[PDB]
C-alpha cells in the first residue's frame, strides 16, 4: 500500500524498471524525452518499499520517489 510517483524529469533509462524485483514499474511511450519513453507505476499494491528504484534514477534529483505509508502483508514481505 505504498505510493510511487514519477515526475517530469524522466529520460527513459529503464534502470528503475530493471532494478525493482517485484515488477511494480513498467515503461510507457511518451513525447517528452529523446528516448520517447516514460516509466509508470500501475501496480503499487505489490510495492515492498525496498527503494532500490530511487537509487537507479541517475538524474540530479529523483524523477521516481517511493513515499512510504500504510503497511500490509505484501508490503511487509511476510512469507507467513
Amino acid at each position: 500500500a505504498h505510493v510511487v510517483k514519477i515526475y517530469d524529469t524522466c529520460i527513459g533509462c529503464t534502470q528503475c524498471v530493471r532494478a525493482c524485483p517485484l515488477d511494480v514499474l513498467e515503461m510507457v511511450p511518451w513525447d517528452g524525452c529523446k528516448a520517447a519513453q516514460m516509466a509508470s507505476s500501475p501496480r503499487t499494491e505489490d510495492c515492498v518499499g525496498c527503494k532500490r528504484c530511487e537509487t537507479a534514477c541517475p538524474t540530479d534529483f529523483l524523477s521516481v520517489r517511493v513515499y512510504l505509508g500504510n503497511e500490509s502483508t505484501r508490503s511487509l514481505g511476510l512469507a507467513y
Binding site: K51, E54, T55, F61, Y67, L68
Partner: protein
C-alpha cells in the same frame, strides 16, 4: 569552578546545535530537498546517495537527549 562552567557552556551550545539543525533543515536538505513531504518522523530515504540514515528532525531530537543528559549530568 572555572573549568566546570566552561564544560557546561560546551554542552549547552552543542545541544542547541543538534536541535537547531533539525529545525531549520526540517523543510529540506541538499541530500533530501523535500523532507516536508515525508513528515517529522521517518526511517530514512534509503541506502542511495551514500546513505541517508538519521536525517529526519526526529533523529536530531533523538541525538540531543544523549547530550542533554550529559550536560545536566
Amino acid at each position: 569552578d572555572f573549568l566546570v562552567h566552561h564544560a557546561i557552556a560546551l554542552g549547552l551550545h552543542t545541544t542547541t546545535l543538534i536541535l537547531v539543525k533539525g529545525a531549520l533543515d526540517a523543510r529540506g536538505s541538499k541530500l533530501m530537498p523535500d523532507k516536508k513531504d515525508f513528515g517529522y518522523s521517518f526511517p530514512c530515504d534509503g541506502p542511495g546517495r551514500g546513505g541517508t540514515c538519521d536525517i529526519s528532525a526526529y533523529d536530531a531530537f533523538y541525538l540531543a537527549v544523549f547530550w542533554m543528559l550529559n550536560t545536566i549530568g
